[PDB]
RNA sequence: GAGGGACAAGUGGCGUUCAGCCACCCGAGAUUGAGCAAUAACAGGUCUGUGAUGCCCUUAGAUGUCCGGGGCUGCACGCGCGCUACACUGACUGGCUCAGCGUGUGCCUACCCUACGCCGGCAGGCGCGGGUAACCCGUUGAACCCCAUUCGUGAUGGGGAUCGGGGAUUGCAAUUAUUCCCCAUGAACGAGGAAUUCCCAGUAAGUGCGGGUCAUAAGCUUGCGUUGAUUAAGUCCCUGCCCU
């Protein structure tokens, strides 16, 4: 059930579209980069955003 | 009140089998001549095979174990496990 | 460095005579341990039930019917008594004849409802070998329990009696009774 | 001389305790730590309905009682100055000599 | 009436009135690649050698 | 080891029958005497409790019956008995076998004189302490 | 070597401790208990006739281990399951007169020191007694 | 020179204090061979009979338990032994022995080193258990 | 208390650039249990929760109000939720042995929890002491379980209702109900027809404790633990729901 919510995918696409540059292919680094470039109210939401951000990075780096 | 019961399964185990509280001398000589020759001695086996009440069975077993003919393997709550040498 | 043994036992060279029950009986060396009572975590995944040792499975199916529910200390005591009975009776290590009773116990074909969405003929189908091990242990403990109900005999004596008369399937045991009864119904619905 | 802070919520408890430690440690006061007494929980369970119709449906109310002890062995003249703090209305203070 | 043994290759699905049965192929070990479709109740993986009491059944479904 | 002693059943208190199962649990068959009063009588008679009823001495039987018919001569204080003090005589006594149903008939007879409703509902087909009788004791 | 009372099998220990109470005769068992007395809430008297020696052995053991107990404390040590019948069972307390009886017996026989806020505790006399008994039961265990 | 590790069974915790010395076992004042269940007076032996001679012969290990239940204490003491060896090897005898003996213990059983997070479920309001409910009533 | 730690992130396979699923390593855990909970309704229930209330009715010989008894309990019956059981995997008797929630007094109007010692067989009593509580009850020495004894297939000692006599204790009062204890009495009941409920892992079930009611007070209910399985991990036949 990783069917992730509209707000999560929305904020994730906004994050990658604004700041592609800081984000890398390392999940634990990208997690802390999300708290620097955004305001996330909760840690579960941080983890969900960062996971789908890394899964988008493994597509954008691909094609 | 009226006696109504919803199931009918009569004819129990064997219809109040009689059992001797005290061993006669013929039964005691039968003990002394073939209770060595059994392979495993429990009070249940001795009771159901020789028509003995279980307390009398435990009395006879604790007798002949004190003779040392029988060999104890273990004892616990409700099971008494025996053998004979050879 | 020691050999992993149950009590006074070897717990070794127990050979399942056929295949179709290998890897569902955990009698092997990587799943042989001292006591049957282990940390039960065997409902997590479907097929990880196979890694339980069959002696623990025999204890688990032995504790039933409310009055005896729980009390794994009591049922491990029962198994400890029963192996001590089978050791004195004919030798031939009780783990081996337990495996032989499991083989010559559970049914190999049954009857069930199949489709076509009409009148159900109770069609004869096969059986999973996991379900053979399960139904084997269930029929063994059921026969032992309702044999030891209301007699001078004990759970230990009736359980050892049921295991020995199931490893020697001479039509006196309740496991061979329900074995033959299920195969006759399957042949009649064949 | 000890001070018992028994409060209604955890955040105001932590804030008044941090203010007390910050107003304590600039002086030469040997301070024992904010020891955490265990949380008492007063529970009330209620039938939820004025008449007994429907599914049996129960409330489950809780309050959390929090408590911190701090020991300040001193002359009581300093403790009179320590007492004067604009304190949050959800916090209760005991002083014991 | 010989008894044959057969090991599972695939799982075609779960069928029955209750969904209890599993239509599967046990292949045949004795000769070349012969495989019939038989019903099994109870859990079954790949690599489960199955005991057959008749190798002449085939109750197929799509 | 006591091989065999020739006894099956005694005649005690002119009405009752003792078997051979034990001594302390076969004196139980006498009315008015149950679980613990026998274990009082047995331990005052100093009998080994392992022995059966079919292995015991008739002199010791008569001594037991003496303990049964009169406890207060030896010991066995007043609180333990069946017939408490305050009676149509005030005697701290133990009721007998045949005397028990007679004392019960005297109880019901003197409650019927008073017409206390305890004895009245006892004479009716009812329960005295049976607080609810919608479902209790049907048929 | 050193043998302490915890280092021995435990029901084996009380089996000899009740005997070495009977050897000395360190007991004041007055009248009613010798007559007949039930336990906490029980139906029969106990079978083993020296059960006051047995209770005294158990009391001596528990006062050696958990010191400072009293009458009601040892009353709750013994532990009551009272099957009331149709109405289900509960934890019922032991009898109080035997609980203070064994205390009065061991106090008169010089095996009870007083913890003054509480009650009974060990004496050095009873320490030597219980300890030599544990040593000889350990020797009987190995032998 | 000593390390204290814990048991963490379900609500049973064994403080295991391992000090250098000849080898002793204090379980609540009482040695190894005397535990409260006679049946599980082999299960707790599994770390000792699995490690062997020169390892307990090198470490003193004493155990203090304020646990929750009989069977829970056995697994708590068991896992406390198996973790006490791990931490005493991290302090005293190097990783080339520690990870190897830890691999032997884990390839035997994971629960000797890994605590299982399985506590109770809270008793739900509708039924008498945590999952079950009362009987409904139709007509 | 602050913070960290778990996201399908890593591998492989199935996948349309996908969405995602399956299997496995590592981890403590590959997700646990709840709470809250939409739009619109029922002619659902409460006027007996209210000084929340319309209208009607009664208001001095009262449908207001006290006060004394009685009663909702009264039994040829049928039905619902449950407790104890039907015994040997057990009862009896002794010994051994480990918990967790949480509760406790001079209170916004009437209120305790118990430690110790001594008397009594038990229920209980009398003096003394503590606790407005991580301080004392209370290292809550619980039951189940475990070891040993006796009982031996017998309506037996399983079963404990029925009921005779007595003794404490609350209370203003227990008798047509208190409650607790002792002795006595010792029934039906042999695992239950038609049918039906509940339940997937610390789960059902055995077992005891704490709270609510209260003075006396649990078989009820609500939380806590303690010992701890079997069989699934699937379908839409039966019951019922959601979308075309
Ligand atoms: Mg049941
Ligand atoms: Mg809604
Ligand atoms: Mg009003
Ligand atoms: Mg009513
Ligand atoms: Mg009815
Ligand atoms: Mg209901
Ligand atoms: Mg009884
Ligand atoms: Mg009877
Ligand atoms: Mg129903
Ligand atoms: Mg029960
Ligand atoms: Mg209550
Ligand atoms: Mg109350
Ligand atoms: Mg109620």
G 25-44: CB within 7 Å of strand I = 32, 37-39, 41-44
Rg of the Cα atoms in chain B: 17
Q: Is the CB of C33 under 7 A from strand I?
A: no
The single residue listed with the structure tokens 């002693």 is: F5
**Do the beta carbons of residue E54 and residue C123 sit within 8 Å?**
no
Query: What DSSP line would sit under C33-65, residue for residue?
Result: -S-S-----TTSSGGGGGGS-HHHHHHHHHS-T
DSSP state of H121: P
**Do the beta carbons of residue C26 and residue C58 sit within 8 Å?**
no
Strand stretches in chain B, DSSP E:
70-75, 80-84
Q: How far is the CA of F112 from the C1' of I68 (A)?
A: 30
CA distance linking residue F19 with residue F25, whole number of Å: 10
Instruction: Encode burial over A12-43: b for 16+ CB neighbours within 10 A, e otherwise.
Output: beebbeeeeeebeeeeeebbebbeeeeebeee
Query: What DSSP line would sit under C114-152, residue for residue?
Result: --SSS----EEEEE-HHHHHHHHHHHHHHHHHHHHTTSS
Distance from CA of H99 to the nearest CA of C (A): 17
**Type and span of the H or E element at G81:** strand G81-82
CA distance linking residue F83 with residue F106, whole number of Å: 13
Cβ within 8 Å of residue B18, ≥6 positions away: B51
**CA distance readout (Å), G108 to E49, G28, G127:** 79, 8, 16
DSSP state of B73: E
Q: How far is the CA of G69 from the C1' of I136 (A)?
A: 15
Q: Give the angle C45-C48-C49 at the CA atoms, nearest 5°.
A: 105
Query: Is F85 in the G-facing interface, judged by CB distances under 8 Å?
Result: no
CA distance linking residue G3 with residue G134, whole number of Å: 7
Rg of the Cα atoms in chain G: 16
Tell me how many residue pairs between chain B and chain C have CB atoms under 8 A apart: 39
Cβ within 8 Å of F, G 33-52: 35-36, 38, 43-45, 47
Query: How many CA atoms does the CB half-sphere of F119 hold within 13 Å?
Result: 13
Q: How many residues does chain H have?
A: 139
Burial of D45 per CB tally in 10 Å (0-12, 13-18, 19+): exposed
Q: Which chains touch A (3 or more CB pairs under 8 A)?
A: none
Cβ within 8 Å of residue G105, ≥6 positions away: G26, G27, G28, G29, G56
**CA distance readout (Å), F104 to C17, C88, D14, F108, H30:** 75, 61, 77, 6, 60
CB contact under 8 A, C89 and B40: yes
| Strand ordering across the sheet containing E10-15 | C110-112, C123-127, E37-41, E21-25, E10-15
Q: How far is the CA of E40 from the C1' of I43 (A)?
A: 56
CA distance linking residue G112 with residue G63, whole number of Å: 9
Instruction: Encode burial over E19-38: b for 16+ CB neighbours within 10 A, e otherwise.
Output: ebbbbbbbbbeeeeeeebeb
Tell me the torsion sign for CA atoms A18, A22, A26, A29: negative
Cβ within 8 Å of residue F67, ≥6 positions away: F41, F44, F45, F74
Return the residue in H10, H41, H43, H100 with the most chain C beta carbons within 10 A, the one to mutate for interface testing: H43
CA distance linking residue G62 with residue G125, whole number of Å: 16
Q: How many residues does chain A have?
A: 63
Instruction: Encode burial over C94-106: b for 16+ CB neighbours within 10 A, e otherwise.
Output: bbbbbbbbbbbbb
Q: How many CB atoms lie within 10 A of CB H2?
A: 11
Strand stretches in chain H, DSSP E:
2-5, 14-20, 25-27, 59-65
The nucleotide whose C1' lies nearest the CA of B42 is: I152
Cβ within 8 Å of B, F 10-39: 20-21
CA distance linking residue F82 with residue F72, whole number of Å: 13
**Type and span of the H or E element at E15:** strand E10-15
- Of B13, B6, B12, B86, the closest CA to residue B48 belongs to B13
Which residue is nearest nucleotide I17, judged by alpha carbon to C1' distance? Answer: A63
C20 vs E contacts (CB less than 8 Å):
5, 48-51
Domains of chain H, residue spans: 1-139
Q: Is the CB of D63 under 7 A from strand I?
A: no
The pairs formed by G58-61 with CB atoms below 8 angstroms and a separation of 24 or more are G58/G14, G59/G102, G59/G103, G59/G106, G59/G120, G60/G17, G60/G106, G60/G111, G60/G126, G60/G130, G61/G5, G61/G13, G61/G14, G61/G17, G61/G130
User: Residue E21: helix, strand or coil by DSSP?
Assistant: strand
Token pair recorded at residue H23: 């080898």
**Do the beta carbons of residue E21 and residue E41 sit within 8 Å?**
yes
CB contact under 8 A, E41 and C112: yes
DSSP state of B48: H
CB contact under 8 A, G36 and F80: yes
**Do the beta carbons of residue B44 and residue B54 sit within 8 Å?**
yes
3+ Cβ–Cβ pairs closer than 8 Å linking C and D: no
Resolution of this model in Å is 3.4
CA distance linking residue H48 with residue H33, whole number of Å: 11
Tell me the torsion sign for CA atoms C136, C139, C144, C147: negative
**Do the beta carbons of residue D58 and residue D46 sit within 8 Å?**
yes
Burial of G135 per CB tally in 10 Å (0-12, 13-18, 19+): middle
Q: How many residues does chain E have?
A: 62
Query: How many CA atoms does the CB half-sphere of F90 hold within 13 Å?
Result: 0
3+ Cβ–Cβ pairs closer than 8 Å linking F and G: yes
Q: Give me ligand 12 centre to Cα D49, in Å.
A: 23
Nucleotides, chain I, CB distance < 7 Å? 1-2, 4-10, 17-21, 23-24, 27-30, 32-35, 44-46, 48-49, 73-90, 92-103, 114-125, 134, 137-157, 159-167, 175-178, 180-186, 188-193, 196-209, 211, 218-219, 221-237
Q: How far is the CA of F52 from the C1' of I182 (A)?
A: 29
**Do the beta carbons of residue H47 and residue H85 sit within 8 Å?**
yes
CA distance linking residue H43 with residue H34, whole number of Å: 12
């Amino acid at each position: 059930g990783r069917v992730r919510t509209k707000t999560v995918k929305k904020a994730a696409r906004v994050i990658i579209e604004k700041y592609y540059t800081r984000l890398g292919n390392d999940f634990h680094t990208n997690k802390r980069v999300c708290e620097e470039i955004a305001i996330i109210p909760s840690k579960k939401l941080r983890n969900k955003i960062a996971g789908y951000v890394t899964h988008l990075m493994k597509r954008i780096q691909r094609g | 009140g009226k006696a109504k019961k919803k199931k009918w399964s009569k004819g129990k185990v064997r219809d109040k089998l009689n059992n001797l509280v005290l061993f006669d001398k013929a039964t005691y000589d039968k003990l002394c001549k073939e209770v060595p020759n059994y392979k495993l001695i429990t009070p249940a086996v001795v009771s159901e095979r020789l028509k003995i009440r279980g307390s009398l069975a435990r009395a006879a077993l604790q007798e002949l174990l004190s003779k040392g003919l029988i060999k104890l393997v273990s004892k616990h709550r409700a099971q008494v496990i025996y053998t004979r040498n050879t | 460095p020691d050999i992993k043994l149950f009590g006074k036992w070897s717990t070794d060279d127990v050979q399942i005579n056929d295949i179709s029950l290998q890897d569902y009986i955990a009698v092997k060396e990587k799943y042989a341990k001292y006591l049957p009572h282990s940390a039960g975590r065997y409902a997590a995944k479907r097929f990880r039930k196979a890694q339980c040792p069959i002696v623990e499975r025999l204890t688990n199916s032995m504790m039933m019917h409310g009055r005896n529910n729980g009390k794994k200390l009591m049922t491990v005591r029962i198994v400890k008594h029963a192996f001590e009975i089978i050791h004195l009776l004919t030798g031939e290590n009780p783990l081996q004849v337990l495996v032989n009773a499991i083989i010559n116990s559970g049914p190999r074909e049954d009857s069930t409802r199949i489709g076509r969405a009409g009148t159900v003929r109770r069609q004869a189908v096969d059986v999973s070998p996991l379900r053979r091990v399960n139904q084997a242990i269930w029929l063994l403990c059921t026969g032992a329990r309702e044999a030891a109900f209301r007699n001078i005999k004990t759970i230990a004596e009736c359980l050892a009696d049921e295991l020995i008369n199931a490893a020697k399937g001479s039509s006196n045991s309740y496991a061979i009774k329900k074995k033959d009864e299920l195969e006759r119904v399957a042949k009649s619905n064949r | 001389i000890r001070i018992t802070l028994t409060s209604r919520n955890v955040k105001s408890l932590e804030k008044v305790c941090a203010d007390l430690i910050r107003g304590a440690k600039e002086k030469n006061l040997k301070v024992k730590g904010p020891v955490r007494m265990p949380t008492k929980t007063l529970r009330i369970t209620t039938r939820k309905t004025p008449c007994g119709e429907g599914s049996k449906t129960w409330d489950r109310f809780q309050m959390r009682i929090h408590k911190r002890l701090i020991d300040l062995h001193s002359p009581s003249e300093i403790v009179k100055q320590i007492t004067s703090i604009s304190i949050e209305p959800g916090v209760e203070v005991e002083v014991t000599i | 009436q010989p008894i044959k043994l057969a090991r599972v290759t695939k799982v075609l699905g779960r069928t029955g009135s209750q969904g209890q049965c599993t239509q599967v192929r046990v292949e045949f070990m004795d000769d070349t690649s012969r495989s019939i479709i038989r019903n099994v109740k109870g859990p079954v993986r790949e690599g489960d050698v199955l005991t057959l009491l008749e190798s002449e059944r085939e109750a197929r479904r799509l | 080891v006591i091989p065999e002693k020739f006894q099956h059943i005694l005649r005690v208190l002119n009405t009752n029958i003792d078997g051979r199962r034990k001594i302390a649990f076969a004196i139980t068959a006498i009315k008015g005497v149950g679980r613990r009063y026998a274990h009082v009588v047995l331990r005052k008679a100093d009998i080994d409790l392992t022995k059966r009823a079919g292995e015991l001495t008739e002199d010791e039987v008569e001594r037991v019956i003496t303990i049964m018919q009169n406890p207060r001569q030896y010991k066995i204080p007043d609180w333990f008995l069946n017939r408490q003090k305050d009676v149509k005589d005030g005697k701290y006594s133990q009721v007998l076998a045949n005397g028990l149903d007679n004392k019960l008939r005297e109880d019901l007879e003197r409650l019927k004189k008073i017409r206390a409703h305890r004895g009245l509902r006892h004479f009716w087909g009812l329960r005295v302490r049976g607080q609810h009788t919608k479902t209790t004791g049907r048929r | 070597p050193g043998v302490t009372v915890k280092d021995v099998n435990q029901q084996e220990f009380v089996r000899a401790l009740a005997a070495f109470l009977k050897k000395s005769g360190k007991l004041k068992v007055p009248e009613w208990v010798d007559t007949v007395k039930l336990a906490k809430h029980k139906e029969l008297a106990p079978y083993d006739e020296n059960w006051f020696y047995t209770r005294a052995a158990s009391t001596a053991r528990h006062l050696y281990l958990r010191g400072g107990a009293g009458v009601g404390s040892m009353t709750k040590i013994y532990g009551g399951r009272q099957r009331n019948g149709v109405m289900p069972s509960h934890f019922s307390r032991g009898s109080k007169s035997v609980a203070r009886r064994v205390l009065q017996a061991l106090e008169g026989l010089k095996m009870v020191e007083k913890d003054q806020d509480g009650g009974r505790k060990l004496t050095p006399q009873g320490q030597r007694d219980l300890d030599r008994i544990a040593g000889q039961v350990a020797a009987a265990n190995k032998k | 020179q000593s390390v204290q590790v814990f048991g963490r069974k379900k609500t049973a915790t064994a403080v295991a204090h391992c000090k250098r010395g000849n080898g002793l076992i204090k379980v609540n004042g009482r040695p190894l061979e005397m535990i409260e269940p006679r049946t599980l007076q082999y299960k707790l032996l599994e770390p000792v009979l699995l490690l062997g001679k020169e390892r307990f012969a090198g470490v003193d290990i004493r155990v203090r338990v304020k646990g929750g239940g009989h069977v829970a204490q056995i697994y708590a003491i068991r896992q406390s032994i198996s973790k006490a060896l791990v931490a005493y090897y991290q302090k005293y005898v190097d990783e080339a022995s520690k990870k190897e003996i830890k691999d032997i213990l884990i390839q035997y059983d994971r629960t000797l080193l890994v605590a299982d997070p399985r506590r109770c479920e809270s008793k739900k309001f509708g039924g008498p258990g945590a999952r079950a409910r009362y009987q409904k009533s139709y007509r």
